[PDB]
Amino acid sequence: XXXXXXXXXXXXXXXXXXXXXYXXXXXXXXXXXXXXXXXXXXXXXXXXXXXXX
Amino acid sequence: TTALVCDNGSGLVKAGFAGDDAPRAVFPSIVGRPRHQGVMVGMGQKDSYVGDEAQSKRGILTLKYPIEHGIITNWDDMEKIWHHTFYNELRVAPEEHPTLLTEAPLNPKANREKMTQIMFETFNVPAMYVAIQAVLSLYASGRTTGIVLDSGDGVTHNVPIYEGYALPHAIMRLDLAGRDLTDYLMKILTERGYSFVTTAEREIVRDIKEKLCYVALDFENEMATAASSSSLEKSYELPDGQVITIGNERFRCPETLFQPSFIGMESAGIHETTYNSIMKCDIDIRKDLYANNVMSGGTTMYPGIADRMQKEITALAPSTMKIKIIAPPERKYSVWIGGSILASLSTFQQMWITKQEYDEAGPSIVHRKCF
Amino acid sequence: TTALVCDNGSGLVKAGFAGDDAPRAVFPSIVGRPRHQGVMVGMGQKDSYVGDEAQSKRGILTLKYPIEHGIITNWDDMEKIWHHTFYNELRVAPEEHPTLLTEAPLNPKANREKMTQIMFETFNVPAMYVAIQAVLSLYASGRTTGIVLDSGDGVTHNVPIYEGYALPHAIMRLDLAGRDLTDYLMKILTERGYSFVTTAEREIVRDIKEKLCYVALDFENEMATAASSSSLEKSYELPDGQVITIGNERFRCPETLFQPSFIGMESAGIHETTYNSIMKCDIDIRKDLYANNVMSGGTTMYPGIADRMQKEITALAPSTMKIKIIAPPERKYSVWIGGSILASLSTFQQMWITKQEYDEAGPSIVHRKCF
Ligand SMILES: Nc1ncnc2c1ncn2[C@@H]1O[C@H](COP(=O)(O)OP(=O)(O)O)[C@@H](O)[C@H]1O
Ligand SMILES: Nc1ncnc2c1ncn2[C@@H]1O[C@H](COP(=O)(O)OP(=O)(O)O)[C@@H](O)[C@H]1O
């Protein structure tokens, strides 16, 4: 007859229960701006190279 | 002042000052929220719940699990958890100590960058570090070389460490941890067909994983005993309600580690992965690792793993050379313990991140500066 | 009658008669088998699958890879592959032609002996030969002297050839080929942390290696551009499913060839190996090789390699003397093409093995008789 607390809480719950949306939103969006450095791990690489040849 | 370490190795979460023998207390990193209209008006509505508080409250709460596969799923939830842990257990303010962070190795930068960003900004904290599990595992186990297996709540590891150095190429990293195994358990359990699926219902299994599991010595022979005997079968109660009694379904579970068919993947298993990763690494070192073989945490708790592991290595090793493994009592705590040691040495004063850098350069700092 | 050549240079496998411009068709040498209970009873169960048939069928199949490091792993599997190739593509019977075999140089006798043994016995074939890659590479490239670099699917090569002769001491042979690089790629890729490990998942990378790679002109300067720009970054789909978009992770990959730290080894790299191997070889010839410098196949496909190579040689050479390199379009086919030329000349009629010898003496015949 209505739109109610009962239904709104249903929607709320389902929202809370839906893992796919929130996890995808955080992980996939945050996955893209991942990386910028002249790695010191690569500093190791360079140093080794210096020692290499 | 004094120095404080968070363990965020998944499962219950471990936090404690440098030099205490064991963390003050420990929390699952469950997060959970209401499921039903709140109908006691007298009740205060809190919309999110965590920790043993939730562990009590569970039934109308429903769980979210903020770390998949060792990757932490939803940051603000973490922030809730983290804040709670400081204030409620620790009675601690972010300024109070350097803080040390505990990381799955070889996993996406994002966890580094946001973790540091949040904790320097949202918390404001003198010094920060993030450290790879195996290092702690060695320090606690106190053998400068080694290889570690620790399959926690989360993603499951092989790292050889030689004394004083990393072999990051050597390393193997696997999503096989006990949680997913447990969820396979239900697909077992419906054979006896007492059957329930939800998150809390899934955690109920964890107790059984404590109590009822033990490692198969030999699979065929065990099946033969399974045909012979019921001593293999033990009787256990619901946490409340029924008595339940369980057959081979107990021992069959760990074999997944040796055979991840049962939830089906190919990586040829813990042991074959290990020997593979060895045969990657170079020739001379190997004997030491044959000597020094080290295991820890969630799965390892099971009685007997080390034995069949040794059986496996005796299969794969040239028998000629010595083999042994270490199985310390305290493995599940091991990491945070090692972290305490890690905290102790003054060299991190040379080594910590400071707020100043975070001012002068971004999260990018970490990935050079830390491993 | 007519004469037929198999290429077993690894990667897709190439076969064709003398005098055709290009082999009739080409196959990966994947081998794969079922992973799951066969549950359509209507289905015919075939237990092993190969070639583009498998490449379609892959998902429930799982792969075996019958050549490691240019060394062919499991003979009977090869025999399956080989039989299939003849009958299904070639519609050919072993009697029909002499057949020519294509070999990594400087590698264990066993491949010679069993290969010949099988193919004379299991197949029965008028004439047999096994030939070293570089010879073909020269013939196709048509400069009687030279040095060749060809880093295929399999083990990666330096041979100087002078006109009409071998310098087997001169030669360098390396397991650095693109496959292992690709498997390193994943240990890169988890930084962005879209992450999957299995064989088919690994081959999916091959497409990206086609599409997305290009050679670093300068590493430092590239990092500076990496800080500046996103044009370095390109957007690419899953073969089906998502769009994926990739940064420096593309260009960083080939540098491994120049720096095999990233999966860590010492051999000072392609170029330094080359100049080393030169400085082994004698003094006067060198100018010719400075002129005549030749590259082919799997890695070389990348745009730009020749340029930075030349940059490297200009580093290491005394600048005073001319330098250039050859980068033909067709390099990946080059070997089989050269093989066709090799097949053409009547002198192999003097040179082939015949069944008679195999009757009268063993596999031992080869190692005298062939290079
Ligand atoms: N008594 C027990 N017996 C066996 N396994 C247990 C027991 N208690 C906890 N575990 C398992 O050990 C793990 C605890 O998390 P942990 O090992 O700390 O993971 P992480 O390595 O991510 O820190 C979980 O997989 C949990 O189910
Ligand atoms: N389009 C492409 N771009 C770059 N590399 C490729 C491409 N197609 C195939 N490759 C690589 O080239 C090699 C093909 O095998 P091949 O070069 O014939 O090896 P071999 O020298 O052992 O015969 C493999 O390493 C494959 O991944």
DSSP notation for B256-275: HHH-TTTTT--S--HHHHHH
- Return the CA Rg of chain C: 22
Distance CA C49, CA C81 (A): 9
Question: In DSSP terms, which residues pair with B161 in a beta bridge?
Answer: B146
- Under 8 Å CB-to-CB from C37, ≥6 apart: which residues? none
Q: Is C338 helix (H, G, I), strand (E, B) or coil?
A: helix
Distance CA C103, CA C132 (A): 5
Distance CA C307, CA C325 (A): 9
- CATH of C1-27+70-134+334-370, picked from 3.30.420.40, 3.40.190.10, 3.50.50.60, 3.80.10.10, is 3.30.420.40
How would you classify residue C321: left for phi > 0, otherwise alpha for psi between -120 and 50, otherwise beta? beta
Residue of B206, B299, B337 best suited for mutating to test ligand 1, as the one with most atoms within 8 Å of CB: B206
User: CA dihedral defined by C201, C204, C208, C210, rounded to 10 degrees?
Assistant: 140
Interface residue C109 vs chain B (CB under 8 A): no
B263: chain C residues, CB-CB within 8 Å: none
How would you classify residue B51: left for phi > 0, otherwise alpha for psi between -120 and 50, otherwise beta? left
Residue spans per domain, chain B: 1-27+70-134+334-370, 28-69, 135-181+271-333, 182-270
Kindly list the distances between the CA atom of residue C159 and the CA atoms of A43, B229, C234, C281, in Å, as whole numbers in the listed order. Answer: 32, 67, 36, 11
Closest alpha carbon to B121 in B103, B98, B96, B94: B94
What is the separation of C-alpha C112 from the centre of its chain, rounded to a whole number of angstroms? 18
Closest alpha carbon to B120 in B101, B144, B139: B101
What is the separation of C-alpha C131 from the centre of its chain, rounded to a whole number of angstroms? 14
Closest alpha carbon to C162 in C179, C178, C181, C143: C143
CB B325 within 8 A of CB B306: yes
Question: Which segments of chain B are extended strands (E)?
Answer: 4-7, 13-17, 25-27, 31-33, 49-50, 62-64, 67-68, 71-72, 99-103, 127-132, 146-150, 156-161, 172-174, 234-237, 243-246, 294-296, 353-354
Question: In DSSP terms, which residues pair with C305 in a beta bridge?
Answer: none
Confirm or reject CATH 3.40.190.10 for domain B182-270, answering yes or no: no
Closest alpha carbon to B325 in B311, B339, B315: B311
CB B274 within 8 A of CB B152: no
Structure tokens at B347: 């060299």
Dihedral of CA B211/B216/B221/B224: which sign?
A: positive
Run of H or E residues at C158: strand C156-161
Place of tokens 């193997």: B172
Interface residue A35 vs chain C (CB under 8 A): yes
Distance CA B60, CA B78 (A): 21
Interface residue A48 vs chain C (CB under 8 A): yes
Place of tokens 């099971």: B302
- Under 8 Å CB-to-CB from C234, ≥6 apart: which residues? C212, C245, C246, C250
Distance from Cα C11 to the centre of ligand 2, integer Å = 6
Kindly list the distances between the CA atom of residue C5 and the CA atoms of C9, C121, C152, in Å, as whole numbers in the listed order. Answer: 12, 18, 19
Structure tokens at B166: 């990393």
Place of tokens 């996993």: B107
Length of chain C counted residue by residue: 371
Intrachain domains C1-27+70-134+334-370 and C135-181+271-333 with the same fold: yes
Neighbours of B42 (CB within 10 A): 4
Q: Whose CA is nearest to atom 24 of ligand 1?
A: B153
Run of H or E residues at C103: strand C99-103
Dmax (CA) for chain B in angstroms is 74
- Under 8 Å CB-to-CB from B79, ≥6 apart: which residues? B118, B122
Burial class (CB in 10 A: 0-12, 13-18, 19+), A18: exposed
Distance CA B369, CA B365 (A): 6
User: In three state form, how does the secondary structure of chain A look?
Assistant: CCCCHHHHHHHHHHHHHCHHHHHHHHHHHHHHCCCCCCCHHHHHHHHHHHHHC
- Under 8 Å CB-to-CB from C244, ≥6 apart: which residues? C194, C235, C236, C237, C238
Distance CA B183, CA B251 (A): 15
B107: chain C residues, CB-CB within 8 Å: 190, 193
What's the start-to-end Cα distance of chain A, in Å?
Answer: 82
- Homologous superfamily of C135-181+271-333 in CATH? ATPase, nucleotide binding domain (3.30.420.40)
Of B108, B265, B267, the CB nearest to C190: B108
Distance CA B46, CA B33 (A): 8
Distance CA C366, CA B12 (A): 66
The atom number, within ligand 1, closest to the CA of B14 reads 18
Interchain contact, B75 vs A26, CB within 8 Å: yes
DSSP letter (8 states) at residue B122: T
- CATH of C28-69, picked from 1.10.287.3510, 2.30.110.10, 3.30.360.10, 2.30.36.70, is 2.30.36.70
Distance CA C36, CA B234 (A): 32
Supply the DSSP string of C190-231, one letter for each residue: TTTT----SHHHHHHHHHHHHHT----S-HHHHHHHHHH-ST
Supply the DSSP string of B72-91, one letter for each residue: E--HHHHHHHHHHIIIIII-
CB C214 within 8 A of CB C303: yes
Q: Is C353 helix (H, G, I), strand (E, B) or coil?
A: strand
Resolution in A: 6.6
Structure tokens at C268: 């000072």
Kindly list the distances between the CA atom of residue B295 and the CA atoms of B135, B219, B260, in Å, as whole numbers in the listed order. Answer: 13, 22, 19
Distance from Cα B235 to the centre of ligand 1, integer Å = 23
Residues lining ligand 2, CB < 6 A?
A: C 9-11, 150, 152-154, 177-179, 206, 209-210, 297-298, 301, 332
Neighbours of B7 (CB within 10 A): 25
Closest alpha carbon to B301 in B332, B326, B343, B269: B332
Q: Which long-range contacts (CB under 8 A, 24 or more apart) does C47-51 make?
A: C48/C77, C48/C80, C50/C80, C50/C81, C50/C84, C51/C27, C51/C81, C51/C84, C51/C85, C51/C88
Q: Is B124 helix (H, G, I), strand (E, B) or coil?
A: coil
